[PDB]
Structures are given as structure tokens and as C-alpha cells.
Design a binder for this molecule. Structure first.
Ligand code: SF4
Ligand code: CL
Ligand code: CL
Length: 303
């Protein structure tokens, strides 16, 4: 097959040129399979910090590769599609952050890791879907500014009991807007299945689910839940990751959900990336120094 030629050439070039391939959980299965590591954005960035290699091929979207770069400034990070981006992250702007800082100067700015690097330079702390509840609990203030996802922010408020001011207006991920009627229909079909949905899902979806977790948390649930069948309310790429990790279980998509920007990465342009060793992720040194502060603040709170 043309794919078998591509995979062979990819593995050949990545060994010859000293590249470690890091793929996000939402990449196509063919790219997850040729990666050295598959995980969420913070997992991949922290994994890179342990590598002796100085070259990384990242398969995801731009804020994730930049996150790798921020925590690994001396490594060459390349991406195969430089336009792979996150529309939810791009809806939050420096102007909106400063507008709300001025309206509420006592409320720390908590920025979901899903954010532009420029916005990260303006945050008081960064958080992931997994650690957002704990990060906000540990902050002194009972009021926080949170962005750029309103559903994760409102979930944090439910769990912490703190006041969470979300920016921008209607900040959301289109991939996770499942219908709660899909949970009703799937519990009829699989009455003993466990339903796991992302915290980015709307509240009626989260409230009808057995678990609410990020992708990193979804793949630890079968370690403590013996259920044969799990229904997954996140992007379709996680089904492949889950089935590969727990082949003795069945994983059913709540609905078919595809992030188009995640699907911009293919075998073809991944091969092109290794052939040309482009496109390198470059940030201004000042952006790296500034964005590190809210990231280090998150490590300190979590540890
Ligand atoms: S799945 Fe949603 S949050 Fe993730 S990159 Fe795509 S649009 Fe952004
Ligand atoms: Cl982990
Ligand atoms: Cl480095």
C-alpha cells in the first residue's frame, strides 16, 4: 500500500534524523501508531522535558506544539501543518483579558491550557481539564477569571463552589457540543455501559454521564471500572487510543465528533515534515519567559 511505503519512510527518516514523534489523542489512528508517545497536551510537553533528543515532530494543534516549545526551548519542534489551530483558544484575546482584569482586579486569571501562547503570557495561572478544579480550589481568591471555555469554567464553579467569571462570551468547543438525548438513547442500547464525557461538554451532557473527565482521565477509568462497555463523549481519535490501551473492553462514541484542525495532520504531510524538517515552531524569547510563569505557578499549586 501507499500507506505502507509512507509509514516505512517515516520510521526511516525519524530514526535517521533523530526525531521523537509526539501525537495528541485526537490525531488519526495512522499517526498515533507511528508516534513515540500519544497523550494530552501537557503530558506530551512534560514527556519531551525528559528526552535526550533535541528534535521533536509534534502532531496536534499550534498551541500544543508551542506548549512543548515553551517547556523545551532548546529543542527544534516542527509541525506538518502550520495552520493547525484551535478556534476556541483563538476567540480569547489580550484585549478581553485586560478588560476583565480592570473590571475585577482581585480575581486571578486562570487560563485553560487550551489558549494562545500570547494569552498565556497574561495569565496568573494555567490549568488543564484534569487539574482545573484543584488549581482553582487552591487559589486564595473565591473569585477567578477563567477562559477560554465556558463549560469547563462552569464545571469548575460547580465543583469548587467559587465564583468563576468566564471569558470570552460563549467560549466553547464545537466538537464537544453533544446532545443529552444521545445519552438517553445509548443507555437504552447498552444498559450496563458507563458513559464518560469531557468537561468541555454542556451541563446537561455532563450531568447525565457516569464520569466527567479529560482524555488523560478517561484512559485511567478502566483501571478501576470493570465495565465491559464505555461510551465516550469526546473527539473520535480517543476511541482508537482507548481500544488500543484496553483491548478487552468496548468503546462506543457517544456521537461522531471530529475536530477538523486535528485532522489536518496526515501521513503525507507528516512525511513531508520529516523530509524538509519543517515547519519549526518559533516563539519570541520574551513570550517563552512570560508564559512560563503561569505554567510554573500551576506546577507549584499541583505538587
Ligand atoms: S477539539 Fe475543541 S478544544 Fe480541542 S483543538 Fe479542536 S476545537 Fe479546540
Ligand atoms: Cl500521567
Ligand atoms: Cl530544551
Amino acid at each position: 500500500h501507499h500507506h505502507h511505503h509512507m509509514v516505512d519512510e517515516i520510521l526511516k527518516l525519524k530514526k535517521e534524523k533523530g526525531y521523537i514523534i509526539l501525537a495528541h489523542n485526537y490525531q488519526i489512528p495512522e499517526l498515533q501508531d507511528i508516534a513515540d508517545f500519544v497523550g494530552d497536551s501537557l503530558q506530551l510537553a512534560r514527556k519531551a522535558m525528559e528526552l535526550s533528543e533535541k528534535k521533536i515532530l509534534f502532531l496536534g494543534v499550534d498551541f500544543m506544539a508551542e506548549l512543548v516549545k515553551i517547556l523545551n526551548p532548546d529543542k527544534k519542534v516542527i509541525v506538518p501543518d502550520r495552520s493547525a489551530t484551535c478556534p476556541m483558544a483563538n476567540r480569547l484575546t489580550p484585549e478581553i483579558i485586560r478588560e476583565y482584569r480592570e473590571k475585577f482586579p482581585d480575581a486571578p486569571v486562570v487560563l485553560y491550557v487550551n489558549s494562545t501562547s500570547e494569552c498565556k503570557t497574561l495569565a496568573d495561572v494555567i490549568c488543564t481539564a484534569a487539574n482545573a478544579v484543584e488549581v482553582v480550589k487552591k487559589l486564595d481568591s473565591s473569585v477567578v477569571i477563567f477562559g477560554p471555555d465556558r463549560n469547563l469554567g462552569e464545571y469548575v464553579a460547580e465543583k469548587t463552589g467559587k465564583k468563576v467569571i468566564t471569558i470570552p462570551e460563549n467560549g466553547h468547543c464545537p466538537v464537544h457540543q453533544f446532545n443529552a438525548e444521545s445519552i438517553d438513547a445509548v443507555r437504552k442500547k447498552y444498559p450496563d455501559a458507563k458513559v464518560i464525557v469531557h468537561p468541555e461538554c454542556p451541563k446537561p451532557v455532563r450531568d447525565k454521564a457516569d464520569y466527567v473527565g479529560s482524555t488523560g482521565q478517561m484512559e485511567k477509568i478502566p483501571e478501576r471500572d470493570p465495565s465491559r462497555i464505555f461510551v465516550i463523549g469526546t473527539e473520535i481519535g480517543m476511541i482508537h487510543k482507548l481500544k488500543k490501551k484496553f483491548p478487552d473492553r468496548e468503546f462506543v462514541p457517544l456521537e461522531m465528533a471530529v475536530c477538523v484542525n486535528m485532522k489536518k495532520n496526515t501521513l503525507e504531510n507528516t512525511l513531508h515534515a520529516l523530509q524538509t524538517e519543517s515547519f519549526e515552531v518559533i516563539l519570541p524569547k520574551e513570550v517563552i519567559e512570560k508564559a512560563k510563569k503561569p505554567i510554573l505557578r500551576m506546577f507549584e499549586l499541583m505538587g
